[PDB]
């Protein structure tokens, strides 16, 4: 018993029941504020699944993370609208799911952290762009403290922010625990101080996946379980670019 | 007059019989060089005919082909039977007097004997297009590098002719002359008449010519 | 898909419109028309492709999205078949003889 | 007294009265035929002015011509849809207009010839692509017969088709005669045997401009008058590219 | 005894006379008012005998250079 959601030009099959967790209990919207007579802005054909490259999960892997909207910067038409518009906004629907037998075990945490600000490997350096992003390729945490020329101070058990890793369930989150689940859904609305801002310059939230109980398998069976993430924009808007004038 | 004309209808401006070809073939074995002959159906062979079908850009019609055939012996038998075979485009064709392309079941053929009213049959509108094209401005290939003009457009079948009797002493030579007329014409989009004599039979190539005759002076 | 009942994978089926080359990467294929077909739920998928008629013409390509997950099988041979049929309305015109048999011989 | 037509994202100011000549008295349409259940096709944001480069008109210039739709092959989004679709159709609106004083004189003919098939410079050669097209740059006629390796047999007074040049007014046409007009409009619908065909492979019609009475000017005044053409697609369609299937 | 139909014979009706005459008669055949019941898959192997369905094994299809595009 399954149904297949489709957003047109893309389709993905999902388990019938898996629950959705709406972050802060509000769906993506188009803003309805007036005084846009002097700054009119149009709403769109970007509302389709984009499937990022799958990553291995193997026993003793420490975690992964990506930063939006700068992980979709090379994807299709949505990447063009970070470059032909100076301001934007957009909510997201994120399905994280994976395969697995019934002989596997372990559970992982899926969380979206608005405004995750990373440390720096040495305690007086400043992290640079290339070490805090990796495009649509997953970045990763590491166990065991080690220096880097810039680098994020990854540690897993501080989460790169110097907070308890067990307390990250304050943000919108889902557990994917093998022997029950194998999928999760988080719908994340646009949260920022200002209503719109430059896509390139800023990051809105950082998806993270942290294994707690690590992968293991009974006699025989594959030594890895692949994970896949799929992200689709919802209710996006961008600044105008039309004169309000005439001849 | 006393009413609207009707001698200048499209249907009466066309649809007149005209000679378009004639050919020869003669009784003889499959060894013999000429012993069957063919003609490819086209309307660009005859200059006079061609002029009046380049009045329009698109046409669709059925056509009637009548062949009138005579024969004569040459210097020193039963009545001869002639076969006329129409091959629709994309069919098999014979390369010799004896083939299985005269025995094929999907090519219409007329057996006819001398001393009868001449054979004819109509061929209905054939083309995957919705009209024949008398002008084309593209290339055969999907990138421009094909053959310019009259590519797979304006392609119709072809006739073949042979005697059906066995060879016998004293050669008989036949001459068959082909008459052609369209019927049920419909024309779309007119053109200005051709002004320069035709050169090739597959191109619109032309040699520049004066517009008009000289006058002795423009004033009267 | 005719593999075992414990095998699970995901394939990305893809279709290219006529007059456009085949995709060269799974990334390319994905951005085209594609149906993600999960083996482990569905055991078949039907694509109904419009606009065939007679080079230029579309392409159908299948791509791994994930590698297959074996139960414990020691030969990883799994297979899939493909079937084809005309769909709904269809039309033909103008009879001619087939090219696959050549003359008599007896 | 003028009004300014606008097709969104573009605007052009036109003289209030100048007449439109609808070619064969039918406007561009979307086809409404059924039996597109097995070959569904979608209709669009290409419906905007495209202004081609202006050409000089000077005394003793012999004429110009362009071939559509292969003169718009580098233009914007409309050029992308000759490359992501295997079949198309589209009507056109063409405004040809020019400047001029009241001290200039001469008149030109504007005509659109469906299925104009060109000759070849030698009478046994075959013209190639590069000599019968020049993209969005105007090609030109020439007076005085001359050979070329391929070339069109241009002559003006045969019009490259071996017909009288005085009899080209059988096709949709407008005279632009200085001392009255300075503009013309031809709306040209899609005319072809088949309902849709490949944009690259075929040409639908050839715009041509032929001076009859040549440019001349009274004491002082500029020695050239510039001509400009502007072409906007209308009611375009292209073949589908969506499965009719399902999972 | 299935698929048994008659047969034709041909002769001249005149008496023999000096100088042989040779005739060639060619036969054309068409059915009309057909009705068909139960379809079959098309024949794939060239016919051998004219009274048996005997055949010589043949490849299903032409080779390709590789299955991937």
Curated annotation (Swiss-Prot), chains A, D:
<comment type="function">
    <text>Forms an icosahedral capsid of pseudo T=3 symmetry with capsid proteins VP2 and VP3. The capsid is 300 Angstroms in diameter, composed of 60 copies of each capsid protein and enclosing the viral positive strand RNA genome.</text>
</comment>
<comment type="subunit">
    <text>Interacts with capsid protein VP1 and capsid protein VP3 in the mature capsid.</text>
</comment>
<protein>
    <recommendedName>
        <fullName>Capsid protein VP2</fullName>
    </recommendedName>
</protein>
Curated annotation (Swiss-Prot), chain B:
<comment type="function">
    <text>Forms an icosahedral capsid of pseudo T=3 symmetry with capsid proteins VP2 and VP3. The capsid is 300 Angstroms in diameter, composed of 60 copies of each capsid protein and enclosing the viral positive strand RNA genome. Capsid protein VP1 mainly forms the vertices of the capsid. Capsid protein VP1 interacts with host ITGA2/ITGB1 to provide virion attachment to target host cells. This attachment induces virion internalization predominantly through caveolin-mediated endocytosis. Tyrosine kinases are probably involved in the entry process.</text>
</comment>
<protein>
    <recommendedName>
        <fullName>Capsid protein VP1</fullName>
    </recommendedName>
</protein>
<comment type="subunit">
    <text>Interacts with capsid protein VP0, and capsid protein VP3 to form heterotrimeric protomers. Five protomers subsequently associate to form pentamers which serve as building blocks for the capsid. Interacts with capsid protein VP2, capsid protein VP3 and capsid protein VP4 following cleavage of capsid protein VP0.</text>
</comment>
